Design a protein around this ligand. Structure first.
Ligand SMILES: O=C(O)c1ccccc1-c1c2ccc(=O)cc-2oc2cc(O)ccc12
Lengths: 219, 220
């Protein structure tokens, strides 16, 4: 199997910036018929891979003039003249000169933007979940930046360390922020053994934590 | 408009078989080599099989991982390719994409998730997420929808039959106790809610579930 190596793994850049992704093969990609079967793809969050550059340097139909492919032999590079927010996602190269066809491990393009604090919302269990005898406490931390954030749940001033599920979205294609969901799943017996439920976040945009809470009885 | 429509994905017990299909339209099918590629968080993107066109006798190739277990075939009369998979293992799990490779370009289908597990199909439990005290965050309001304990993926979530697009966040599903749980938020202009009705619609093909929950105000 020919090995494809992609560098870097992550590439943060600002709108307008130029970006360079490199891809190397363990063996020559020049086919005995004389073509070099090296292609570049972009996979946007949630979508399937889309071809950008075919055979080292041919810009595919409908691809912006700001993407160019270059290289030969075993070193190829993909250049993006001026990064736009919609270029966000993972770029892959592949070789199809040899069977098996193989892909690089991908390079994630991240867009650097101005810090933005989390818009926090806390949600207590709906009557319907309580009837099934379940109590899930949901907290949304929407549109922040950078990705690095920390959430903690406090039940009656104490720190809960069991029953929390966290999920992060990929970076947004439109405004380049991140969101995150944090769910505290308790049985209803568990949920009525306490009163204060607190969603607490730590983002470098504020020195003090962003706190959102609600009390069961206070409800 | 080209499209590669792949179908036949879903949940299947290890050791059992599965058959995927791909229908192509919008380009000259006989001028292309068809390939199935799969993607999984573990190994990332991996090529699995290929079937060439007429000029090359419909020759087929496979990766060592599936040789002997997978068979690929095509029918130029129906613009279709098929992937017959037998004795599936955990390592075969992933999103399978139908692809067509040609002289001037290449296209990829949308992908179909194949889940190889012994677990049984579990319908999701859908619950609305209304504010503790619905007023105004700024010029907006965040509402939600919890899709609890289902199996397997995927689950489709839309807001207002689809009419509400901007301001929607659907988080990746997370595996808890052998089950998936997922949420979706949507932010709407304050004057809009609770004035007009907002509802999440959830669809879980595997269990043939289709739920529509309206998001109502809740002081509690
Ligand atoms: O490059 C070609 O001549 C070609 C033309 C029509 C259909 C397939 C191919 C094609 C190949 C044809 C002959 C060959 O020996 C190797 C080929 O590799 C290809 C690799 C691709 O990614 C994409 C396409 C090919």
């Amino acid at each position: 199997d020919v090995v494809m190596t992609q560098t870097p793994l992550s590439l943060p850049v600002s709108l307008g910036d130029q970006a360079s992704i490199s891809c190397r093969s363990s063996q020559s990609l020049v086919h005995s018929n004389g073509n070099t079967y090296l292609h570049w793809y972009l996979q946007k969050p949630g979508q399937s891979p889309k071809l950008l550059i075919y055979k080292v340097s041919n810009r595919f139909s409908g691809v912006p003039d700001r993407f160019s492919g270059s290289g030969s032999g075993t070193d190829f590079t993909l250049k993006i003249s001026r990064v736009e927010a919609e270029d966000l996602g993972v770029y892959f190269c592949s070789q199809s000169t040899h069977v098996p066809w193989t892909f690089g491990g991908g390079t994630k393009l991240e867009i650097k933007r101005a810090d933005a604090a989390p818009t926090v919302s806390i949600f207590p269990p709906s009557s319907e979940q309580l009837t099934s005898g379940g109590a899930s406490v949901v907290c949304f931390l929407n549109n922040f930046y950078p990705k690095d954030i920390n959430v903690k749940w406090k039940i009656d001033g104490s720190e809960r360390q069991n029953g929390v599920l966290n999920s992060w979205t990929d970076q947004n294609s439109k405004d380049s922020t991140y969101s995150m969901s944090s769910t505290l799943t308790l049985t209803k017996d568990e949920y009525e053994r306490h009163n204060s439920y607190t969603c607490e976040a730590t983002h470098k945009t504020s020195t003090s934590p962003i706190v959102k809470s609600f009390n069961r009885n206070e409800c | 408009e080209v499209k590669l429509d792949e179908t036949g994905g879903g949940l299947v017990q290890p050791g059992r078989p599965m058959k995927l299909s791909c229908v192509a339209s919008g380009f000259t099918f006989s001028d292309y080599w068809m390939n199935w590629v799969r993607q999984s968080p573990e190994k990332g993107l991996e090529w699995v099989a290929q079937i060439r066109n007429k000029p090359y006798n419909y020759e087929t190739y496979y990766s060592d991982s599936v040789k002997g277990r997978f068979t690929i075939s095509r029918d130029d009369s129906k613009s279709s390719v098929y992937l017959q998979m037998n004795n599936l293992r955990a390592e075969d799990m992933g999103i399978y994409y139908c692809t067509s490779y040609g002289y001037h370009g290449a296209y990829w289908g949308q992908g179909t998730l194949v889940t190889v597990s012994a677990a049984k199909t579990t319908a999701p439990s859908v619950y609305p997420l209304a504010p503790g005290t619905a007023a105004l965050k700024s010029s907006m309001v965040t509402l939600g929808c919890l899709v609890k304990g289902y199996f397997p993926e995927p689950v489709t979530v839309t807001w207002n039959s689809g009419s509400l697009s901007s301001g929607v966040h659907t988080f990746p599903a997370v595996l808890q106790s052998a089950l998936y749980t997922l949420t979706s938020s949507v932010t709407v202009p304050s004057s809009s809610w609770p004035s007009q009705t907002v509802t999440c619609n959830v669809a879980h093909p595997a269990s043939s579930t289709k739920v529509d929950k309206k998001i109502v105000p809740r002081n509690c």
